[PDB]
Design a protein around this ligand. Structure first.
Ligand SMILES: Cc1cc2nc3c(=O)[nH]c(=O)nc-3n(C[C@H](O)[C@H](O)[C@H](O)COP(=O)(O)O)c2cc1C
Ligand SMILES: Cc1cc2nc3c(=O)[nH]c(=O)nc-3n(C[C@H](O)[C@H](O)[C@H](O)COP(=O)(O)O)c2cc1C
Ligand SMILES: Cc1cc2nc3c(=O)[nH]c(=O)nc-3n(C[C@H](O)[C@H](O)[C@H](O)COP(=O)(O)O)c2cc1C
Ligand SMILES: Cc1cc2nc3c(=O)[nH]c(=O)nc-3n(C[C@H](O)[C@H](O)[C@H](O)COP(=O)(O)O)c2cc1C
Lengths: 337, 337, 337, 337
């Protein structure tokens, strides 16, 4: 069969194909309480009916002031568990595995009131200047990622992804452009990686299954992080037991980025080869042929699809047709697929 | 713009486009009680996110012994109202109008215990011989359609469609191949149409909104009904206030049917022209170009899509692209559509 | 199989499928002598490699002053025979049948010097007023169509089509908007049809093969011709032995025309049914599904494709795939098709 | 603009886009004299109308007994010049550049009579055992490549490609699996490369423009050539002035090859990076998105397309649409493209 439709086992989890629905915020928690709504249920469950191997739920805030917007999903309260338990059960019933992206927006939070970051440096001229987190607050935030992971386990998720990309809180600590701290969380690469190191270790105290980390593999900026820095972080993550690195890029600060089909694939390939770490490729992958090429040429292990799944929730069927292969159809749609 | 994406008003109901999700059984009421399940919610709401103008819910039985299978949806009990009320609210919130198809499978019911029909004639060699309904039983069934319509109104549906096609109960009364009665419900075309006439009049006593009737416009069998018979029934339905005839065909008995793209369109165009009745075209319509041609050449008023919406829930977007035109995207997907 | 790919016989000519390359001017006779050039050869032969059943060569003038532009192909001279003989041999060797459209642009000729028409009425504000043809000149033109048909027979064409559409000479005689004559060629519908009647009878004196006539089935103008007029002309053409009417529309004068997929199909279906004449459908037909529907619903006998064959010379292969059916590939491309 | 539609200059030749029609035998020289036929003219010229930047004519034999089949094109005689001169002129007139692949089938020639190779080893059990070329015959063959290059220059080609792949004569000398010679043309990599070295040097005596060499970058066989061997040959070719290496693979002997979209791209990327040589990628590249990714990620400089151009001669237009960009249309097709 085609590699895109070949299984892969990570820890005790077996994915039936290599297609992953990339985490994508829906800004649909209209009651501003981080809870799920019927829209979210239909949105996610339809891609499970659509046969996506693994569906990663959008950035879910570990603290309310870590939301990107006040309509974001949250996982900062035990009240969020009931809704997620229904979602995981329904997605798995349709045949898919499900994960959740744990997040904190840091200086990119678009909320009223103080927002937080490793250093008091604004994202851009249109943004509020964040408050530098005290060491106590940094440690409390590590505990919030741990507590959120425990809630995700209770809710029944199969995979937990740590959002260490797109200019959000963890990425701000990793990069010298945004982290000018003079304590244990700033300076050397070891100190800049410390926040993420502590989050991974603490999450591992309450969660043993698949652990993914999404990174922005380059800042595309002078004096910022580049792929060499991320290969270094990837080797430390492998030592800590991270199972896969989801390779994105950018958004710490505004930058000129040449976007084209597969523009982030080189990051996934280099981290996979140099850090001996399984990787997820993402970024303008819109068809089965490219997905198959990426996997067959050993550039990544999982293919993350974002916008094409917004256009075609049944991308798995489309890709199977493009690759002239067959895949099981949801039972209810057998006189159509 | 494109006619397919131009609004149309029927009664006090305005549809934002002319794409209709044809009713399609999901055989997913697992507890055998006719109730909705989470799968049904995701299945239907996803096409509302997908911008279908009107979603018609699958054949819903007006009597438990009128189900096609024991996993069918039902609307024979007030217990069914709560679930439908949630479904109509959620589909409408996503921007579509919603209808329900009221049904009774007659001699094609695949259930244990006596099944019913206008005459004791089995569908085929592998089916049970049905019990000839007494006139009392026929009248009780008319009241069940009325009671089901009252529940549909309470549950918030925008449109009610009467299932008078596909060899089910009403179609069995209409055709001389299946109706050999010698009382007021058989013999002449007027008497064979009487059951449907009474259902329409009684439904109108509790429902003043858009009323559609789905017919099988031909039996494709010698001595059976053909399009001329249906043009006659359509004129009678127009006098009774039916708003649109959804034009399907076949399934009263096994028959050789030549299927091809648009194979039932001639029925919709002839009834539209000769009975001066709005019509719905359905049958192997899978792309926007054909849909637009049907509407622009005056062959039908609404385009019903079945299997293509099982392969592509977002057919509206695909058709808009094929017709090189722009349509609003659900707000959550503006970055992908 | 699919009707689009089923053979059809007209006279002693069997077409392997029902796809026709509609005549389309290439404005490529650079020496202004009406002769073929290497571009024309590649242009036409490539669609024969592409499996089009019948290729109709673009409007070819029967008189030099009847060209639309000075870069048009011509068939007014015996010097044109040699080039056409090579083209017909080469297209037929690749497996297709070939036709030629005999033409005279009348008042729409974009040439210096006097241009001709049934009456001295200009096409529009930016066009020269034509010279009213004397009866002698009309008769000379009928002989030029006859002489051109004899050359087409000598050159090896399988089909001859008379261009009586698009506001050109014959169409100008047919319509009361452009023909104000008071002699035998004007006044009544019979007199307005006389020029075409004489062309058909004279062509039949030198050609006994398939004879097609392309018409503009409506002028889309008050007091102009409409489909009822053309159904009448079609009955007369049937009596004269015309084999098929290629149904186009418009262009006699500027008019508002609503264009959409299949916008001229109603003309082909009405002439086919009411005049009992085989018809060719043309106009925004771009996919196999629509083509198959037109044929299966009895709206036309042949499907003419214009612009889609300019975008996709191998439309036959694309349509076969869309219809999930197999067709023979040119032997040279068996490893790709 | 997109890199696929960005120009590139090689020597004095500027290609308007990066799409190349890969050389593909047509087995259509039916008179068995190696001459062109009308089919070849339409076949090649149509892809020039289709806007392919560079069209490489199929393997053309430098000696009649070096043909793969007796219906192959040839360039072993001055009689072949006239036909090629017409083809190059017509392809360039449509806006494309044109090249020719100089070839000798060696032990894979399917001809009657003795066939030749570096050693008397048959291709497989179904093939004739070739005659080991004497050193004099090897030197005569080098002169035949030189003489053929002179004919190609006279005929007006813009690029000459040497066919050193697919198990044919030059590849047989390069590989230890097929070359067991004990003279100056066998043994060490220097001796095995000598035949190709002499061909390149001699061709350079009569041809200064763009010179491409197509190689099979792996034999996929134990003790055969692999990418490391070809990076070595590529460095020697760069020293000799070869402008680009067209990277194919296989066919020296039967082997198990895992084929998938982009399966030969790694060879193009490694030779480009390690030998600082421009490269052509080929092998199951069927869409614009993959073509763009290959170019943007620096894996190759030109994208060679084979079978997709047999299915879609106007692939350039299709790819431009896929990449949401615009490209000039052939003038004759402007109301269609
Ligand atoms: C509407 C929208 C919301 C997104 N939200 C998130 C998010 O919550 N977390 C994340 O890591 N990436 C997010 N992304 C980035 C996507 O997951 C994905 O990495 C990006 O769109 C590149 O892939 P694509 O070209 O397949 O869309 C979002 C993208 C879109 C279009
Ligand atoms: C799985 C399935 C279930 C269906 N159930 C129903 C139904 O409940 N009511 C009905 O009137 N037609 C039913 N149909 C028929 C469809 O509504 C539709 O008329 C038919 O499939 C022709 O349209 P299409 O070619 O667009 O699918 C069903 C079809 C399918 C494939
Ligand atoms: C470039 C071009 C040239 C044409 N020249 C002719 C012609 O010589 N004769 C004719 O009858 N129609 C001519 N037409 C009209 C076409 O044959 C065809 O009827 C029209 O384009 C409608 O079909 P389509 O939508 O498949 O293109 C031409 C159309 C185009 C685009
Ligand atoms: C019918 C056919 C003939 C071919 N003849 C040649 C040839 O003359 N020279 C050559 O180098 N490759 C030849 N090939 C290989 C192609 O140029 C190309 O490298 C191969 O098909 C891989 O590319 P694709 O997947 O885009 O077709 C041929 C392929 C086909 C299908």
């Amino acid at each position: 069969a085609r590699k895109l439709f070949t299984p892969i086992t990570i820890k005790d989890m077996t994915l039936k194909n290599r297609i992953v629905m990339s985490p994508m915020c829906m800004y649909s928690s209209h009651e501003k309480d981080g809870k799920l709504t019927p829209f979210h249920m239909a949105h996610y469950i339809s891609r499970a009916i659509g046969q996506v191997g693994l569906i990663i739920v959008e950035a879910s805030a570990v603290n309310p002031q870590g939301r990107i917007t006040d309509q974001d999903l949250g996982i900062w309260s035990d009240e969020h568990i009931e809704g997620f338990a229904k979602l995981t059960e329904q997605v798995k019933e349709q045949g898919s595995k499900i994960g959740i992206q744990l997040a904190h927006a840091g200086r990119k939070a678009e909320l009223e009131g103080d927002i937080f970051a490793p250093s008091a440096i604004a994202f851009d001229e249109q943004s509020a200047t964040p408050v530098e987190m005290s060491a106590e607050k940094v440690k409390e935030t590590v505990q919030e990622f741990k507590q959120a992971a425990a809630r995700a386990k209770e809710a029944g998720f199969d995979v937990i992804e740590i959002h260490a990309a797109h200019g959000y809180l963890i990425h701000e600590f990793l990069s010298p452009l945004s982290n000018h701290r003079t304590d244990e969380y700033g300076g050397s690469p070891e100190n800049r990686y410390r926040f993420l190191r502590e989050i991974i270790d603490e999450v591992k105290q309450v969660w043993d299954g698949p652990l993914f980390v999404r990174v922005s593999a380059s800042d595309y900026t002078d004096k910022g992080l580049d792929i060499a820095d991320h290969i270094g972080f990837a080797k430390w993550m492998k030592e800590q037991g991270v199972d896969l690195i989801d390779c994105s890029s950018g958004a710490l600060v505004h930058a000129d980025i040449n976007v084209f089909p597969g523009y982030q694939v080189s990051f996934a390939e280099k981290i996979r080869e140099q850090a001996d770490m399984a990787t997820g490729a993402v970024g303008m992958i819109t068809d089965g042929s490219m997905a198959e090429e990426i996997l067959q040429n050993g550039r990544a292990d999982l293919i993350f699809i974002g916008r094409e799944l917004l256009r075609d929730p049944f991308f798995a069927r489309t890709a199977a047709k493009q690759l002239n292969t067959e895949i099981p159809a949801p039972v209810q749609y057998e006189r159509g697929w």
